Symmetry: C3
């Protein structure tokens, strides 16, 4: 069987708990899943390569002294911008991000006409043609690849929700919590931290 | 639509992408919730401009034991609210009058209690159009357009009240105080710098 | 004029605030209510009998030590544990609890075939084929008595939600809070607690 975990994909079946009234939700959760996938991975990798929590990473790059993020990346012996130049600038990064992500979102969602000329209908979260340089979808199964991605989508969104509530409970960070739970499983869990009071009680 | 350009839409204008419109009672609830929110956000706006007390702390000034503090709080007042010598707006006094007046108005708004007026005023209609609009602004103005204006103000003010309650929970400083801090230096005074400070808990 | 209150029962009428959802919700609210009945009664009785909150009561039986719960039951002729060996140890109780409850839930919902084969159908709101040994309510106005328990379900669920929320607010316990209210409501209240700050502000 395909998708036998719990419930069924939006493409086929009905939610056990929700009515699934609106068909905008399907692609919404695809996009949300993909973003979460990149977010969870980011939180996984940053705290490994740098040791900082993902939720306090924002404090390193601020409109004054954004140079803290420079050279934080593993390997990458050259910093983001040279030391002493002070060019890692929150506003410069923010403007570059605003223009790039805003243009990408406008192209995806039809706020602006697509720059390309080859199909790419607005609102489809599986474009394929331009977004498969390797040609893995035509070689593989399209439907089961889409199901795998969905499983990853929902798994990563649930992992992100876990990351934020772990951040709120323990105030430490995802990987450090994972390592504490691995080291002493009985003595590092949610009920253990509840016995400590979650840091406020 | 042409008239409603906001992200969402008005009930009857169409259907919302998220949580589409169900029962009409939901639309009545939205309008009334808006109306009370407009009143609430305006009160939280004007009171601490007049005297500086955040709305989430203004409750405790009046207490069953002592309620003198609420008297003479309104700026510009010619005299005390009740005798200067012995202010008599006691919390119980306030309650006993207000529960009766508000309960009456509510039951008479919804018609669970027989209407006093019986002027053709039909309960369960957000726009009574009777004595409530003596100016009859709706009669001169265009009623569809004006309904859209009312709902836009409803949603804006309900969102503003949500902002007021969450700002109270994060910064516990006060709405206009948060405004003045942000206008003072928005770059270094906003939600994310308060997050860096930790919202007062972390 | 049965159920002449704010709302209506799932069988007749429609939900005033929330969309009625599905039949799955209609069967599920009752089960949540039965569990909330048991939970609220357990919190009430454990606190009257022991004096320590239901929430903190989870720290009494830890993997390292479960002997604290040995002599907590009021009016017990002897402690359940021998007091001297600490035989519970949280592991026997955990394992037998998970097997018994998991089996019971599996048989309730037909995850596994029912063993009685007494004609009972899985997923029924009120099976009653062997869940009414006394028969006092089976014979005579069954529909009304379902309304009775329905009203108790919604109450116990609301009471549990209030229990968890004011546990969060005050961190003292439900009936400690109830005694504080009853002794002098006017100076010991939710709004008084908010003005002083529940545990914060
Ligand atoms: C939507 C994407 C995104 C999300 C979810 C976050 C989320 C966060 N950022 Mg980041 N950021 C994001 C994008 C960006 N941030 C920054 C720059 C910063 C700074 C400068 C700071 C944060 C901070 C924070 C944290 C607290 C602020 C908040 O709103 O939580 C409120 C809490 C909720 C639960 C939301 C409901 C939180 C983990 C702050 C921080 O680290 O505080 C500890 C901080 O000071 N972020 C930039 C500019 C490059 C971004 C660009 O898109
Ligand atoms: C040959 C150069 C070089 C080498 C050996 C490594 C080596 C490594 N990098 Mg680095 N990196 C290098 C260049 C760069 N890295 C990064 C950005 C990153 C990221 C974003 C990540 C790594 C990660 C890793 C690890 C896999 C490993 C420690 C990954 C890791 O696991 O971090 C611990 C990871 O996620 N590197 C950039 C962009 C500025 C580079 C540019 O030159
Ligand atoms: C000579 C009389 C008189 C004068 C000049 C003022 C003048 C003022 N009052 Mg006061 N009031 C007066 C009598 C009274 N006021 C109030 C109750 C209020 C309220 C409820 C409000 C004011 C507000 C204001 C301010 C309007 C600023 C803007 O607009 C201003 C300081 C407003 C304010 O705070 O704006 C800053 C406001 O919201 N006054 C009452 C009823 C108790 C009064 C009775 O006579
Ligand atoms: C629409 C009605 C209404 C609303 C929304 C509020 C809202 C509030 N009052 Mg006010 N009040 C209201 C009517 C009245 N109050 C008072 C008199 C008081 C007093 C005496 C006190 C409050 C307090 C509070 C706060 C309670 C916060 C809380 O419980 O934790 C948060 C709850 C949530 C987030 C809900 C979920 C909040 C700002 C208390 C306070 O904050 O004191 C500083 C307090 O002590 N109010 C009277 C009678 C004269 C009212 C009459 O209708
Ligand atoms: C109590 C207030 C309230 C009520 C009853 C409604 C009701 C309605 N709105 Mg309105 N709306 C509101 C507030 C409200 N809205 C606010 C504040 C905004 C601005 C963000 C809007 C923006 C809006 C748009 C843009 C649209 C609607 C639409 C609708 C209809 C869709 C069905 C629905 O969502 O109902 C259920 C009612 C809800 C309020 C949804 C629940 C929201 C959840 C619970 C999140 C809220 C979190 C909460 C504030 C947490 C507080 C915690 C705090 C106390 C600590 C219905 C008539 C749609 C419509 O009519 O389309 C034809 C539509 O397009 N509304
Ligand atoms: C576990 C929580 C839970 C669950 C699953 C439900 C589920 C349901 N309730 Mg119940 N209810 C609950 C909590 C819950 N309620 C509590 C705590 C209260 C007390 C405030 C109520 C009071 C209540 C009323 C008053 C009504 C419902 C109704 C309903 C239906 C509405 C659909 C829905 O929300 O799903 C469904 C059977 C409605 C219904 O069955 O429609 C006729 C209805 O009229 N419920
Ligand atoms: C005081 C609360 C109360 C009341 C008066 C009833 C009353 C009734 N229930 Mg409900 N019920 C309750 C609590 C309550 N129940 C709780 C806590 C549980 C869980 C242990 C149940 C589990 C339950 C089941 C599983 C069944 C009933 C049945 C019945 C009937 C016997 C009668 C209508 C039976 C029935 O109606 O059979 C037709 C039936 O099948 N109820
Ligand atoms: C039927 C359920 C139920 C019952 C019997 C009680 C009973 C009680 N509560 Mg609890 N409570 C409930 C639901 C309930 N509450 C819910 C749903 C909430 C969350 C909104 C709370 C939050 C709450 C707090 C924070 C506090 C109490 C307190 C109290 C006691 C005094 C009443 C009071 O000041 O607050 C009554 C407030 C409510 C009933 C909330 C009503 C909100 C809905 C939306 C209306 C009393 C024992 C207080 C206490 O003992 O300390 C002095 C206290 O500090 N309760
Ligand atoms: C990497 C990085 C580094 C920096 O340090 C900081 C930083 C913040 C920038 C960060 C960047 C992160 C990013 C870009 C994140 C993007 C995240 C996103 C899009 C998250 C979405 C999260 C979604 C959630 C929770 C869903 C909850 C919904 C639930 C359970 C309902 C489930 C439900 C339904 C639907 C149907 C069933 O039948 C029944 C049930 C009830 C189960
Ligand atoms: C004035 C005063 C002074 C004293 O000092 C103190 C004091 C406390 C007494 C105080 C008194 C104030 C009072 C009485 C206030 C009354 C306030 C009221 C009625 C608030 C209502 C607040 C309503 C909210 C948040 C709604 C949230 C809903 C949201 C986002 C969903 C939005 C949604 C929908 C629906 C469908 C779309 O498709 C899209 C999306 C998903 C966005």
């Amino acid at each position: 069987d395909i998708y036998p975990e719990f419930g069924t994909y939006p493409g086929g079946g009905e939610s056990p708990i929700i009515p699934f009234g609106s068909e905008k939700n399907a692609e919404r959760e695809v996009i949300h899943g993909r973003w979460a996938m990149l977010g969870v991975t980011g939180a996984w990798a940053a705290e490994n390569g740098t040791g900082i929590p993902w939720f306090t990473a924002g404090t390193l790059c601020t409109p004054d002294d954004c140079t803290a993020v420079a050279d934080k990346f593993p390997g990458a012996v050259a910093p983001l911008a040279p030391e002493g130049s002070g060019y890692p600038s929150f506003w410069n990064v923010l403007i570059i991000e605003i223009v790039l992500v805003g243009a990408a979102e406008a192209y995806r969602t039809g706020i602006s006409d697509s720059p390309f000329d080859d199909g790419l209908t607005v609102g489809d979260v599986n474009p394929g043609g331009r977004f498969d340089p390797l040609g893995l979808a035509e070689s593989g199964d399209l439907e089961e690849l889409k199901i795998k991605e969905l499983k990853h989508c929902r798994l990563s969104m649930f992992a992100w929700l876990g990351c934020i509530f772990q951040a709120l409970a323990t105030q430490e960070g995802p990987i450090a919590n994972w390592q504490s739970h691995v080291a002493d499983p009985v003595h590092s869990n949610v009920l253990t931290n509840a016995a400590k009071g979650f840091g406020f009680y």
